[PDB]
Structures are given as C-alpha cells and as structure tokens.
Amino acid sequence: VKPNYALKFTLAGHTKAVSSVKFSPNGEWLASSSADKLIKIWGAYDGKFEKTISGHKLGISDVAWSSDSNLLVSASDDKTLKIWDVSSGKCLKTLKGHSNYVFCCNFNPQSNLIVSGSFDESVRIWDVKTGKCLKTLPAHSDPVSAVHFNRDGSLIVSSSYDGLCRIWDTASGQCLKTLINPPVSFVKFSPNGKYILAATLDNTLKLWDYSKGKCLKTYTGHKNEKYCIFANFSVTGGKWIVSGSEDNLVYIWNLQTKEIVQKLQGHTDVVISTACHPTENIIASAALENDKTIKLWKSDC
C-alpha cells in the first residue's frame, strides 16, 4: 500500500552540484555526474566510494551504463560525450559533433548505440565501437532535455523545451509520433514500452499512451518549474512513480491511484536526480550545489 524508504547512506565527494545518478544494470554500482567535471563510482549497497573518473573539460549533466555494466557514457557542457571503461577509468572514445552543451545520454539495450540530446536542439545517434555519429536528427526547436531507448532498442523518445515529446524509429531516424505547450523537462518509456512518463515545468508528471495520444495518469504535489528533474518507474516492490523536487524532497506516488505515498526528507537543495535499483527496493537521489550529496534509501516494499 505504501513503501517505507528510509535513509541508509549519504555519499559526499562532489565539489559542485550533482546532476545525475544511475545504478549499474548488474546492481553493483552507482555512477554520479557533476558540475565539478567528474564522474564518481560508489558501491550500491553500502555507499562506499570506489573511484573518480575524469577527462571532461566542463560540467557533466548525465551519465549512463552499458547493459553489461562495463562502459559508461557521459554528456558534457564541453559539447562532447565520452565513453569510459569503468574498470580502468580510461576514456575510450570522445563523441564530437554537437555544437553546444550535451544534456542527456543513453545506451540502447544492445549497447551498440548511444543516443544524445543537446542545447543545439538535435538528437544524435552514435556508434559505440567507432565513436562516429551515425545520424543527426533535427529533433526539436529548443534544448533537448531527455533521450531514452525503449526496452528492445527499436524506438527513441525525446523531450524538449519546445513543449514536445517525439518518438523516433532508431534504424531510420524517422519521427513516428509527435505528442502535442509547457517545456518538457524529462521523458522515458515505461518498462513495457507502451507508455511514456513525461515531466513538464508546470509541476506535472504525466503517464501517456503515445500511440493513442491519451494521458492516462497525472502526478502532482511536487515542485518542478525550473530544473530538468529525472523521474522513474519503481518496479521491484510496489508499483511507484519516483521523482525529485525543487522543495528538496524525493516524491513517491502510487502509479495507479496517483496518490503521494511517501516524501523523503534530508536533502538541502533541489533533488535533480533519482534512480531505482534494478533488483532491490533501493532509491538513490542527488542534489544541487547547496547540498552536493547523493543519498541511498531502502524500503521493505
């Protein structure tokens, strides 16, 4: 009926705002990115600091893991993405092509491709092996806030400040659907691929059937009017929607009822990123520059 997330660890180390936290697909690790130009790796279960990965010339808005947990990709203000070998910390490839800040990134499930979104209003699809840009999609008419592949890699969803969500055929780069005006600050596919979860900067999360163009659920109560705040489907226990908020709380809703089921308190700045562990009822959350910490929370359901 309600989860009971409680604070377990606070992970300090970043020297500026933390932008993104992601659990490795194997459940072992948490990666974080920061305005401090660094990626840090932490133990998912005990929060123990593992390593710092460096090389970007400016702050990093996003990081993402390959399916085998061996590679990371990062999106930076230095206009590049970088592919990293996690074990060695080495930069394998620098992905060059965007003409302004890179804000978001993801591997496809296959992990042979990376998708990126930029201030430059494009979505780019990159070859992991070669580091070359395969396609440049003229995706939006304002900054791209989020990019995500569906569970089989066949589709990409993008969101933008232009107020649109768009679904793209990965293979061809063709736009299959435009969902249509407040800025769209976050989007991702549901695990079953049928729905998209989208955040808009009028303090609203919406669950959409994008084929029909029908809004199924609306989640409100949190504050989201300024920052591109990451949200999640929590699926390991109860079926929840999880998001950060500009009031320094993590919000958790019941997906079906739309009721707030828990608010997690502890952060001292905007919670810009949340992540849900792949197998356990564990949440990671990260905050902006008044705080600079990552917190790990555990629930019994």
Ligand SMILES: Cc1cccc(C(=O)Nc2cc(-c3cccc4c3OCC4)ccc2N2CCN(C)CC2)c1
């Ligand atoms: C290095 C760093 C540290 C802390 C927060 C940020 C930030 O907020 N990112 C950002 C910014 C924008 C954005 C949108 C429109 C216009 C501008 C922007 O930045 C400068 C000018 C969009 C998305 C994003 N992100 C947020 C984190 N998320 C995991 C991916 C995307 C970045």
